[PDB]
Amino acid sequence: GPKEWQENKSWNAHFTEHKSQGVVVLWNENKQQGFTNNLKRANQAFLPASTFKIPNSLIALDLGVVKDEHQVFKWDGQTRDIATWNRDHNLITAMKYSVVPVYQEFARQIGEARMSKMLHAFDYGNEDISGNVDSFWLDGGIRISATEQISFLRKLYHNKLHVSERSQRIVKQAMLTEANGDYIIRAKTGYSPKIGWWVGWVELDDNVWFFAMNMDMPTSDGLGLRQAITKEVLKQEKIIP
Amino acid sequence: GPKEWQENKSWNAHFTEHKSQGVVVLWNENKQQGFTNNLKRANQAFLPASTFKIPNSLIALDLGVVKDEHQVFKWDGQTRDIATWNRDHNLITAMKYSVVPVYQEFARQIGEARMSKMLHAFDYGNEDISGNVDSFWLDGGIRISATEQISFLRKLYHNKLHVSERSQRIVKQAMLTEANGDYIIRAKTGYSPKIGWWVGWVELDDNVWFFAMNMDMLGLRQAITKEVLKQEKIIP
Ligand SMILES: *C(=O)N1C[C@H](NOS(=O)(=O)O)CC[C@H]1C(=O)NOCCN
Ligand SMILES: *C(=O)N1C[C@H](NOS(=O)(=O)O)CC[C@H]1C(=O)NOCCN
Numbered sequence: 237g238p239k240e241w242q243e244n245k246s247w248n249a250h251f252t253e254h255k256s257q258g259v260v261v262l263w264n265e266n267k268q269q270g271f272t273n274n275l276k277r278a279n280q281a282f283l284p285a286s287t288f289k290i291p292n293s294l295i296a297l298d299l300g301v302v303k304d305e306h307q308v309f310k311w312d313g314q315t316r317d318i319a320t321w322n323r324d325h326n327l328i329t330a331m332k333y334s335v336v337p338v339y340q341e342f343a344r345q346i347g348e349a350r351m352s353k354m355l356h357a358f359d360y361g362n363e364d365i366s367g368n369v370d371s372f373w374l375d376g377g378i379r380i381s382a383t384e385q386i387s388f389l390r391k392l393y394h395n396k397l398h399v400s401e402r403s404q405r406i407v408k409q410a411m412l413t414e415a416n417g418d419y420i421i422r423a424k425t426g427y428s429p430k431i432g433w434w435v436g437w438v439e440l441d442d443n444v445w446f447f448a449m450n451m452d453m454p455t456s457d458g459l460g461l462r463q464a465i466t467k468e469v470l471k472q473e474k475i476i477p
Numbered sequence: 478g479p480k481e482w483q484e485n486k487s488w489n490a491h492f493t494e495h496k497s498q499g500v501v502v503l504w505n506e507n508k509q510q511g512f513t514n515n516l517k518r519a520n521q522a523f524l525p526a527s528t529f530k531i532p533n534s535l536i537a538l539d540l541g542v543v544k545d546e547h548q549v550f551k552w553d554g555q556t557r558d559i560a561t562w563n564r565d566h567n568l569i570t571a572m573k574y575s576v577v578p579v580y581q582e583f584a585r586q587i588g589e590a591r592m593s594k595m596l597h598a599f600d601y602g603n604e605d606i607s608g609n610v611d612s613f614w615l616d617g618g619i620r621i622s623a624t625e626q627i628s629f630l631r632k633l634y635h636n637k638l639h640v641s642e643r644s645q646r647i648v649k650q651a652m653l654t655e656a657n658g659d660y661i662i663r664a665k666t667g668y669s670p671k672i673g674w675w676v677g678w679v680e681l682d683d684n685v686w687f688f689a690m691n692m693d694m695l696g697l698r699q700a701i702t703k704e705v706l707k708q709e710k711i712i713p
C-alpha cells in the first residue's frame with residue numbers, strides 16, 4: 237500500500253537548473269499524504285534562522301509582549317545593513333521585512349524560561365534554546381527539520397498550538413505573503429550561513445498544501461531561488477497555475 | 478484650517494473613459510482626510526447589495542450561526558446561473574464567489590429581530606431591514622452611502638464593532654482579495670439593479686486607505702477604483 241511520504245526525485249531538476257541542491261517537502265491536507273524529492277534531507281534538522289519568527293510571534297502575542305499587530309515598535313536608531321530595518325515597524329511589517337532587532341527584543345522580553353517552556357509545548361524541533369535567548373535560532377543549538385516544520389505549521393493552521401486562538405490567527409495574518417483569485421500563500425523565509433528556508437502553506441478553495449523547503453546557499457545571492465524553486469514544484473504538481 | 482474632505486473631479490475621467498458615471502471615496506487613515514470626485518454622491522444612500530455580505534458574515538459568526546471559516550454549507554442541489562455557486566462552500570469561498578443562497582440561509586437563521594438589533598448596534602446605514610429577511614439588502618429598505626460604508630469599515634478594521642474581536646478577525650480574513658509585496662486589499666463587490674459597488678481598504682506598510690466606490694451600471698468596478706488608486710500614488 238501507499239506510503240505516508242512519497243519520494244519524487246524529478247524535483248531535483250528544479251534545483252539542478254539553478255546549480256543548487258535542497259529539499260522541498262509538501263503535505264496534501266485532504267489526502268493526508270506527503271511528497272518530497274529527498275526523504276533523508278526532509279528529516280535533516282537545521283537552524284531555523286528567520287523562520288523562527290513564526291513561533292517567536294506566537295509566544296510574544298500570547299504573553300502580551302506584543303499587544304496586537306498594530307502596535308508600533310520604534311526603530312532603536314541604530315543604522316543596520318538592511319535599509320528596511322531602519323524604521324518603525326509593527327508585527328505585520330516586522331515579519332514582512334524580517335526585522336531581526338525587533339524580534340530580538342521580543343525574545344529578551346519573553347525570557348529564556350518562558351521561551352523554553354513554550355517551545356516544549358509546541359514540540360518545536362529539538363526544543364534547545366542553548367545560546368543567547370536573543371540569538372539561539374541564528375547561532376545557537378536549536379535545530380528543526382523540514383518535516384518538523386510541516387508538523388508545526390499544521391498545528392498552527394488548525395489552531396492546535398498551546399497558545400490562544402487569537403495569537404494563532406494574528407500570526408497567520410502576519411504570515412500573509414501573496415494572494416490572488418487562484419491561491420493564498422502564508423509563509424516565512426529564512427537564511428543563515430549556507431542554508432536558505434521557505435516554509436508555509438498554499439490555501440486553495442477546497443484544500444491546503446503545506447510546504448517546507450531548504451537549500452544550500454553558498455552566498456547571499458540567489459535568495460529569490462527559495463520561492464522560485466518552491467513555485468516550480470508547486471506548478472509541476474498543479475497546485476498553482 | 479485644512480479640510481477633512483476634498484473634491485478631486487479629475488477622477489471623472491476614469492469613469493467617462495468607460496462611458497460610465499460614479500463616485501470613488503478614499504479615506505487616508507493616518508491623515509484623517511477623505512477625497513472623492515463627487516461630494517454629493519459620496520453621501521447619497523443606495524442599496525448595499527452583496528456588500529451586505531460583510532455585516533451578514535459578522536452577525537452570523539457572532540451569533541454562532543456560522544461556527545468558523547471552515548464550516549461547510551452544502552450545495553442545495555439547485556443549479557444556478559453562476560457556476561461557482563453550484564458546489565459546497567465555506568465562509569472564505571462563499572465570500573470570494575459571492576454565493577447568494579448561502580447568505581440567504583444565514584439571514585433566515587439570524588432572523589429579523591437579531592438582524593435589526595445588530596444593524597442598529599453597527600450604526601449601519603439607515604439601519605432599516607424592511608422587506609424580506611433574506612433579500613432586504615438587494616430589494617428592501619436598507620440604504621447606505623459610500624461615506625457610511627467607510628465609517629463602518631474603519632470600525633471593522635479597528636475591531637471596534639460591537640461583535641466579538643474574533644468575528645471581526647474572521648471576516649477580515651474572508652475579505653482578503655489580493656496581496657503582494659506592495660499592498661493588501663480586503664474588499665467586497667456588489668451589484669444591485671443599476672448600481673455596482675466595491676468597498677474595502679488597501680493596507681500599506683505604514684498607512685491604510687479605505688475606499689468605497691459606486692457606479693451606474695463588472696470588472697470596471699475594480700479597474701476604475703485602481704485607476705484612482707494609481708493616480709493618487711497609493712498602488713504602483
Ligand atoms: C533570518 O533568516 N534573517 C533575517 C533576514 N531575513 O531575510 S529573509 O531570508 O529574506 O527572511 C535576513 C537574513 C537572516 C539573517 O541574516 N539574520 O541574521 C542577521 C542578524 N542581524
Ligand atoms: C450581490 O451584489 N450579488 C450577488 C453576486 N455578487 O457578485 S459581485 O457583484 O461580483 O460581488 C452577483 C450580483 C448580486 C446579485 O444578487 N445579483 O442578482 C440579482 C438577482 N436577485
Ligand SMILES: [Cl-]
Nearest residue numbers: 285286336339
Ligand atoms: Cl529572526
Ligand SMILES: [Cl-]
Nearest residue numbers: 526527577580
Ligand atoms: Cl448577498
Ligand SMILES: [Cl-]
Nearest residue numbers: 409412650653
Ligand atoms: Cl489574512
